[PDB]
Amino acid sequence: GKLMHALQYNSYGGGAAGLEHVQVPVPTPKSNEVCLKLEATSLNPVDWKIQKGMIRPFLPRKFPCIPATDVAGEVVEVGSGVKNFKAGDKVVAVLSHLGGGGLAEFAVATEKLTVKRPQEVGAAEAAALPVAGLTALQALTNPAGLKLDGTGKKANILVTAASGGVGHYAVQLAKLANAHVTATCGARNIEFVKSLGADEVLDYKTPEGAALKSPSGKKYDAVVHCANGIPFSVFEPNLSENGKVIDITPGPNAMWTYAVKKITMSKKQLVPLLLIPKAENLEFMVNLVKEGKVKTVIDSKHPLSKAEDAWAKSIDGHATGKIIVEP
Ligand SMILES: NC(=O)c1ccc[n+]([C@@H]2O[C@H](COP(=O)([O-])OP(=O)(O)OC[C@H]3O[C@@H](n4cnc5c(N)ncnc54)[C@H](OP(=O)(O)O)[C@@H]3O)[C@@H](O)[C@H]2O)c1
């Protein structure tokens, strides 16, 4: 019965204050799970949303909850039925949102959602990938219908909040797909988003950025919508005839909009997106980082002993790239 350091919250609404440092049993791998000694964990906005109560009645399943799901680490123990990993292997993995366990010294992941991390890729650089990166990949690959080898159709992509976790992957992945990328962000990251490969960058505080209006007049074929303030009517004049707004933060309004735009057979569509994590895709993204085709941008690094600072930074929402917790 080894013990570990972890952070957990015990109730809704506590913010970073409600995040409490605790000493808890190291989890035991089931027959299909692996136990990782964590080398890096990355936060996602859904992590603090769950704690706030915004994902009720789905999450969290039970209190207390150890938050975060994107991890990179070293395998220390594998389950009786695990074939692809042994102790000592460096990996990157996605933890179940049901059980969490990223802000801890150790975590268990299923074999299905664990991928070998090549030595060319650091732990933090890899831990930033699972949620943010796979979401960008899914949005551009399914609804936007792009191909990242070069077969794909030419296209105009808008990426809102291009400076955040999903956004900053989306911009880079979109360029690998030979698309014209228009991006929105704050004034301080304009040069940053340009360096990711965006053809046009808008400051969303300016009138033109708020209208999402392309400085060269482009109509968008698909929007990877990573921000939150914007009603469909703002997107509509900027969409091509059959353009899709891919809302990666679907709420009740999005769902309803989706419904009536299906019902009324609208040519311009709003499409909710719910990430489906698959190892093939994680393996694919990790490989892109290895080959230097995609770079992970890290907002900040925090030790586990001060992880409430990383949490606060997530909550605040001004992250540029991915927030990382290290041991
Ligand atoms: N459905 C799913 O499966 C799924 C998966 C992943 C994420 N999400 C959701 O998608 C959202 C974004 O995720 P994320 O990790 O990429 O967020 P994030 O990294 O935490 O957001 C940070 C960036 O967004 C920028 N931003 C905020 N408001 C903006 C606006 N109105 N216009 C342009 N930029 C803006 C911020 O810029 P400034 O500091 O300059 O203001 C900041 O740099 C979250 O709501 C998240 O829950 C959903």
Author numbering: 3 to 329
Reproduce text from the manuscript describing this model.
The chloroplast envelope Quinone Oxidoreductase Homolog (ceQORH; At4g13010; molecular weight 34,034 Da) from Arabidopsis thaliana is associated to the inner membrane of the chloroplast envelope where it represents 1–2% of the crude envelope proteins. Despite its original annotation as a “QOR,” ceQORH is inactive on quinones but preferentially reduces γ-ketols in the presence of NADPH. γ-ketols are long-chain reactive electrophile oxylipins and are potentially toxic. The ceQORH monomer is formed of two domains with (i) the catalytic domain including residues from Gly3 to Pro132 and from Leu277 to Pro329 and (ii) the cofactor binding domain (Val133 to Leu276) showing the classical motif of Rossmann fold. In the ceQORH structure, the internal chloroplast targeting sequence is folded as a two anti-parallel β-strands (Thr71 to Gly81 and Asp91 to Leu97) connected by a long loop (Ser82 to Gly90).
In the crystals of the binary and ternary complexes ceQORH-13-KOTE and ceQORH-NADP+-13-KOTE, the asymmetric unit contains 12 and 8 ceQORH molecules, respectively. NADP+ is bound at the interface of the two domains and the nicotinamide ring is in the vicinity of the catalytic site. Comparison of apo-ceQORH and ceQORH-NADP+-13-KOTE monomers shows that NADP+ binding introduces local changes in the vicinity of the cofactor. The orientation of the Arg190 side chain is modified, stabilizing the 2′-phosphate of the NADP+ adenosine moiety. The loop containing Thr251 in the Rossmann fold shifts and stabilizes the ribose group of the NADP+ nicotinamide moiety by interacting with the Thr251 hydroxyl group. In the ceQORH-NADP+-13-KOTE structure, the aliphatic chain of 13-KOTE is observed in electron density up to the C11 atom of the α,β-unsaturated carbon-carbon bond (C11 = C12). The distance average between the C11 atom and the C4 atom of the NADP+ nicotinamide ring bearing the hydride is 6.84 Å. The flexibility of 13-KOTE and the large distance between the α,β-unsaturated carbon-carbon bond (C11 = C12) and the C4 atom of NADP+ nicotinamide ring are not compatible with a hydride transfer. The new position of the α-helix Pro254-Met267 observed in ceQORH-NADP+-13-KOTE could prevent the dimer formation when ceQORH binds NADPH and may explain why ceQORH-NADPH behaves as a monomer in solution.
